[PDB]
Amino acid sequence: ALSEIKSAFKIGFYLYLPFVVVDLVVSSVLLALGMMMMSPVTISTPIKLVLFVALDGWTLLSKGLILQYMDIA
Amino acid sequence: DKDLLKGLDQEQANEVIAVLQMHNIEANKIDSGKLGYSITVAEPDFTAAVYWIKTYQLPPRPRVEIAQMFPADSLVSSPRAEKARLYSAIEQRLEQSLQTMEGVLSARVHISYDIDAGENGRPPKPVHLSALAVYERGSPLAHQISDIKRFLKNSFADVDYDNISVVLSERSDAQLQAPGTPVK
Amino acid sequence: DKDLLKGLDQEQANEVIAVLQMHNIEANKIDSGKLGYSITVAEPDFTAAVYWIKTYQLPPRPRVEIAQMFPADSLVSSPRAEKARLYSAIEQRLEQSLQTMEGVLSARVHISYDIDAGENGRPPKPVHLSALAVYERGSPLAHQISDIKRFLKNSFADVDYDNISVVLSERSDAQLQAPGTPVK
Amino acid sequence: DKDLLKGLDQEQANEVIAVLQMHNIEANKIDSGKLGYSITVAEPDFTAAVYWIKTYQLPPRPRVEIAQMFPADSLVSSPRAEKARLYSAIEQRLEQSLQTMEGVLSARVHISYDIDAGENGRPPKPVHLSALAVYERGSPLAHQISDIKRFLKNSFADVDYDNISVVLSERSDAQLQAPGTPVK
Amino acid sequence: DKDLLKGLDQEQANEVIAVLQMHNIEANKIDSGKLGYSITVAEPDFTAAVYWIKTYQLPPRPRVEIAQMFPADSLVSSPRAEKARLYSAIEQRLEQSLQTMEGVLSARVHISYDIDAGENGRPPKPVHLSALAVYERGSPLAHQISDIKRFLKNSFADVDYDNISVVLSERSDAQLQAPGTPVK
Amino acid sequence: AELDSLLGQEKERFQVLPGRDKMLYVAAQNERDTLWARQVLARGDYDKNARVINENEENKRISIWLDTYYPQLAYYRIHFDEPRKPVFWLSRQRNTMSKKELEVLSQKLRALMPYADSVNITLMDDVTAAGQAEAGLKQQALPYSRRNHKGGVTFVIQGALDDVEILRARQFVDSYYRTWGGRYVQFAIELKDDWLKGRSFQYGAEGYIKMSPGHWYFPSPL
Amino acid sequence: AELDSLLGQEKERFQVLPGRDKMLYVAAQNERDTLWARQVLARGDYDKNARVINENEENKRISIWLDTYYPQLAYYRIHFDEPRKPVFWLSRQRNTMSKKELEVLSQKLRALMPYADSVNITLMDDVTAAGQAEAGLKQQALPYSRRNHKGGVTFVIQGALDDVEILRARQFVDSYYRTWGGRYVQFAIELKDDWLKGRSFQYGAEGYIKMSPGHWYFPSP
Amino acid sequence: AELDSLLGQEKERFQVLPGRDKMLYVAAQNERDTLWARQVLARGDYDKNARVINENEENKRISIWLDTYYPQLAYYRIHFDEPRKPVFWLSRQRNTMSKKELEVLSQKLRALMPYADSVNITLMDDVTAAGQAEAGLKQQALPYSRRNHKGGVTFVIQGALDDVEILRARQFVDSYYRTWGGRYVQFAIELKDDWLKGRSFQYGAEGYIKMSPGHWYFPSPL
């Protein structure tokens, strides 16, 4: 069990990495305009949510996680 | 000198002249500058040259490969779009390797592609190969079929000798003499 | 004086000339600086030179390799791409090491590609090899087939002697005399 | 005076010269400053020299090594790319150490790449080596196959004397006399 | 006065001259400031000197080390890239200590590398060594196996006397007289 | 310019024969020198008429005339070592010809080849043609299976052969057809895998194939 | 100039023989000198006619004539150690020739070799030809199997040979083909992998191989 | 421009012999000095013709002539310690030539070498050839397996030998091949993995039985 919490926490960081690029590239285009004060979270979450289902995310990590364990499909 | 074709390619005009000179009519590879090449035939040879253009389907289309519609420039690529690009480079490298044998002028190799087995619950099927070849004449081309099946057998994981079909043929007659201008 | 191919590079022009010169026609290679080379023949030799361009599929296309379909400049690299870029550099190093033997002028090695064994929990299959070679004439090329098998057997994990197929052949007859200018 | 190749390299021109001087035809290494070297032969010796360029596949391509397909400048580096960059430096250092033996002129060593075996839960398989060598003539090259096996048996984890295959040969007859200019 | 190499290094030109001077041909080393040295040879000796450039694979590549594939300036260092940079400096320090013995002119040591024992629960295995040496002539080179084996056996944690492989040899005959100018 | 000087520098590979029908035959010995000589006569830098002959082409051409004017003939090959007096190898134990019509055939074959002066007809024995074919097939350690029927034998070489048994079985057949012809004895090399690949079977006169541990298949008696 | 001055500097590796049909013959001794001397005559710096002969392809040329005009003839090799009087190694126990037709065969071989003056024909036994091939194959300690039949003998070398024995075999077959040729005795080196590397088995009369603790393999005799 | 002056400064490592066929021979000693002397005669800084000979390659050249005109002859080596008078070591117990056909062989060996004056033929014994190869192999404490047969003898050294036994065996075979040559007795050094260095036993009901020497070896778990 301690080897599975270790093997899960370093997969979730790799998953974490593209999103940080997204909410760092949408928060910096507001400061290029005169938008220094508006909150970028309410703009970050739809542009992060319509990209993950359009690129078929939840059927890409559900396949890639079961391929570690068994001969799926 | 009525014109027939224009806007062609360097290799598209060398096939039109090679077809028309086989049927006793001459042609002219007139350069058009920045437009390309243009083939002009004589006036008595215009009816025959139009009929052999329609019959032989000239000018030739560019030859297609499977890895041309799954380009490697996209930011994401499916495993379906990565196995078709791997197999399309294997079936070209095997075609380049078959031409260096003793007597072969040209060849063509096909491999069975795999689509549904990446996601369906079935294991992937066996691999099937198919080859064509054109041999220099004077060759006993019944014995050459055992040197191509032996070379193509263990270049993959596991194929049988029943899953390989080789259909080869000797080349045509030589064309050496000039066609001849119409006596007018 | 008629031109048949322009814009060719150096390696393409030296293989168009070497094909035409063995069929008793004389070609002329003309440099043009930035626009590349160009090849011109005489007037009686044009009907035959177009026929050998069509038959031999000249100019030669560049030779393709599997490592070109998966470049190392991509931001993400699948394990199917890293294994495809590994086996294509092993089969290039093996054919560059076969030319350092005694009598070999050219060689070409193929490896069976296995890519789907690593993605899921299936065990890998055996690995297959296949080679071609061109030898100097005067050599007993029946006993030269055991050294390429012994060299190729333990360059991988575990192969047998039934998964290696070597097809080798002596080189063609030497062309040393000049073609001959047509009198008129 | 006719040009064969141009835009070559310093190490690429001495191989074309070393091949043409073996077959009784002269060559001239002309430097062009920034554009590279160039090699010209005489007009009676142009028909044979194009034939040996086509046969011997000149100019030689640069030698490929496995550490070039996985460069060190990458932002991420999988353990597949660290083991491939490691084994590709061991088989370069071992073939640099084989050239310092008594009588060896050149050599080449291949390691069996097993990259996924240590990753998977299955135990890693045995490692196989293979070597080629070119010896100075006058040597008893049947007894020297045991010193190379003794040298590279203890350079890895667990190799047997059955997983090492050494294929070696003596060098060619020396070319010391001048070719000779064509007299007309 | 025909040049054959230029742009060479200081230690590269001393390896080209000492090879040519062994075979009765003399060469001139010419400095060029920033563009390196250059070696020229006489006209009757150009045919032989090209043959020994091709045979001995000159100019020499710089010698490779395993610590160059894993540079220390990288921000992320694996345990594999730290264990390989450790062994790649123990391997150089041992061959630098082998040259200070009584009669050794050159030496080369090879440590067996272990990588895939640290990341998984597999235990490490016994480490193997291998050596090469060149001794001054007139020395009993059969009794000096036990001194190198005794020195190497206590520089690691667990090695056996049948896990160490020493292959050594005496040096060549000295070249003391001048080549001589080719008169005509 | 003469014809022997309009060809290449090496005046050893070609041989010009003065024909009897006011022509001039050049005799090459392979298909690369035949195209080397046909390019000269096709570009038209020679005034008179000339033809290029060969060994395999002329031996294929004369069998079309002989397959119409002399059917049911047992012959092997026409040999052209000296191209002025060719040798016609005829069978002995298969013909019904006396001494008169052999001279008639030797005059009608002379009229088909204008470069020749006389055609020599020698009768080769019929048993040594298959004795050399079997003894040369046993020295190469090749497995084979001889089938005897009237007017021709047949050697079948099948199974999974390795790379030495293909290269040894091809250099012998091409060296035997060159000196005997493929009229009488025929080799059948056939590289295929083993029949009934991974199936256990019960051979001999009442046979079945076990498709599974519980599946019997009853084809032809294996 | 003369032909021996248009060749290389060292006038030892080429022998220039005067013909009989007003032609000149250059006798090289391998393929590298044959292609060295053919570039001279091919580029055309010589007035009259000349040819380049060899050891191998001259033994290949007069076997094409000798399988048309003299079939069923048992011979070994035509030796050219001195090119003006070659030696013809004919067989003794397989020919039916008297004293006269050996002289007619000598006169018909002299017409085939215009550079020669006489042809010396000797007769060798077929016992020493197959005896030196078995004693040399036994001295190198190689595994072999002899198969005798009429008009030929073959030696089969099989097994999982190492890298020393495939070099000892090649240095012997190459040294034997140079002397006797492949007309009588033929070597067949094919190498296979071994099954009983890690298996336990019983050898002898009742032989089997245990491929597993629960798996027997009975090989066919 | 004399030939002894066109060589190096030290005029004691070469030796120029006058020939009978008007040609000067330079007798070098090893392979490194043969190319040092061949470069001089290749660059062409000498007027007349000359040849360079060697002890290792005049014995390889004279055996090509000898196994065509005198087959089934038993001999060992030709020694060139005095190059104007060599010694030919013939076998006494394996040939029955008389005195006259030994003087004809000595004159035909003389006409092959134009630098010699008289070839001296000595008959060496055949027991001491295989006797000094066994007595020199027991002195280095090496494991071996003597195999006698008709007209030759072979010594096989198998096993997982260490680095001292490889050096002493390779250092001894090179000192025996120089004296006797590999025509009669041959060594078979080969490394494989078994701690019993060549010998093998089988165990039943009485102790151990020394097995026959064979090709199959038992790999050693140890």
From Swiss-Prot, chain A:
Cellular location(s): Cell membrane
Record-annotated membrane-spanning stretches: 11-31, 35-55
Role this protein plays: Involved in a secretory pathway responsible for the surface presentation of determinants needed for the entry of Salmonella species into mammalian cells.
Family statement drawn from the similarity comment of this UniProt entry: Belongs to the FliP/MopC/SpaP family.
Name this polypeptide is given: Surface presentation of antigens protein SpaP
The organism of origin for this protein: Salmonella typhimurium (strain LT2 / SGSC1412 / ATCC 700720)
Encoding gene per record: spaP
Entire protein: shown range: 151 to 223 of 224
Curated annotation (Swiss-Prot), chains B, C, D, E:
Keyword entries, A-Z: Cell outer membrane, Lipoprotein, Membrane, Palmitate, Protein transport, Signal, Transmembrane, Transmembrane helix, Transport, Virulence
GO biological process, one term: protein secretion
Topology within the bilayer: Lipid-anchor
GO cellular component: cell outer membrane
Subcellular location: Cell outer membrane
Keyword Transcription among UniProt keywords: no
Stated family: Belongs to the YscJ lipoprotein family.
Function summary: Required for invasion of epithelial cells. Could be involved in protein secretion.
UniProt protein name: Lipoprotein PrgK
Gene: prgK
Residue numbers of the full-length protein present here: 20 to 203 of 252
Swiss-Prot record, chains F, H:
Disulfide bonds, paired cysteine numbers: none
Membrane topology qualifier: Single-pass membrane protein
Domain of life: Bacteria
Subcellular location: Cell membrane
Keywords: Cell membrane, Membrane, Transmembrane, Transmembrane helix, Virulence
GO cellular component: plasma membrane
Function: Required for invasion of epithelial cells.
Name of this chain's protein: Protein PrgH
Organism the protein comes from: Salmonella typhimurium (strain LT2 / SGSC1412 / ATCC 700720)
Curated annotation (Swiss-Prot), chain G:
Sorted UniProt keywords: Cell membrane, Membrane, Transmembrane, Transmembrane helix, Virulence
GO cellular component: plasma membrane
Superkingdom field: Bacteria
Protein name: Protein PrgH
Whole sequence portion shown: 171 to 391 of 392
Principal localisation: membrane
Intracellular or extracellular location(s): Cell membrane
Membrane topology term: Single-pass membrane protein
Function text: Required for invasion of epithelial cells.
